[PDB]
Design a protein around this ligand. Sequence first.
Ligand SMILES: [Mg+2]
Ligand SMILES: [Mg+2]
Lengths: 207, 206
Amino acid sequence: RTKEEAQETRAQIIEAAERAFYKRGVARTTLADIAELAGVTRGAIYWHFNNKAELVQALLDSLHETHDHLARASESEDEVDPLGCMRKLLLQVFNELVLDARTRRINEILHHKCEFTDDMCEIRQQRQSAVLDIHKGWTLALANAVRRGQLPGELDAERAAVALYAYVDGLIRRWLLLPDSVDLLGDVEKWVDTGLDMLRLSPALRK
Amino acid sequence: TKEEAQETRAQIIEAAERAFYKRGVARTTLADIAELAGVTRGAIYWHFNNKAELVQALLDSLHETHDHLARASESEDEVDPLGCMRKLLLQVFNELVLDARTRRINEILHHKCEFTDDMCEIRQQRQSAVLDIHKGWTLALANAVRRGQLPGELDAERAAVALYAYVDGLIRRWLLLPDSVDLLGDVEKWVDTGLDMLRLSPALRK
Ligand SMILES: [Mg+2]
Ligand SMILES: [Mg+2]
């Protein structure tokens, strides 16, 4: 069928884009390069994607799927243990980064093999949107945890969400750069609780 | 003469910041930078063997302003090593927000510089630079432990990693979304939030 064959083609393109961007970077890779790696025609790849920026976004967008269940739970005001949902969420983020070759490779592309240039302004714009989306969700989950007595009552939820994101994002990039400097999988619980401890203990994050 | 060459080097590095910031590192060549700087007859290749050496020069330049406080925090004779670390981090954030050159170089290194194994040196040099920072921060935190400023059972190495993750992440976050985080007005609070992680989290203790 048309759709089944089209989904298969799009999937081949995306897998080849991961391979191309990881080895040679986003800047110098072309859609024609990716089509040759995927074994599809140039008419096919350009039918699925208009430019490289759309292929980068497809990889970026693919990262949230695994975590959607725990994210929504943490953000629900009816959830009785919102902080516990955040802890399970962060454990899953790190566990997937270490174990999944795809998650690791996409993260490496976004962090270390993809430049922000006004020649391709959409890459930076869409990164801004993704990070703001995460911020909005984490601010809600932290406020819920405050409401349930799991975090300090005077916590600045917004600054707390920024502090947590900084730590998590910085540890991901540090592990990608020096994977042997950090036993992210074996000590994963310790790395998660270090971040949460910052939020629930530091008086600098309170109003 | 000696000053002619030191001037020419500075002209090149300043043009490299302009070229890398506009077009990124991957697609910028030493030839492009030379024309942008206006230095002729192959002079740029006298100063830099390749583009990765130029990139390292930009990164190396970030350590200069903080060297006094970094060396102090690491000295065994320093009686206030954690206070040195606080002053170090305050200055890092103050310079990042206030200094156009520091901000632009950080944006280049964080957001406009690909690691490609055709240019394997860029990644390798970044690894060595972050390992150097980690060695120094581990020593400064160990000094703070010795001086009773941090918990005796602190895992100095993991604490240095945790602090770096936070600082590095906060810099990148501010570069991406500067209007979200008043890094300058609230600088003391952003610093103390990270230091509080080390002072208070039982998860960083051995
Ligand atoms: Mg996933
Ligand atoms: Mg400086």
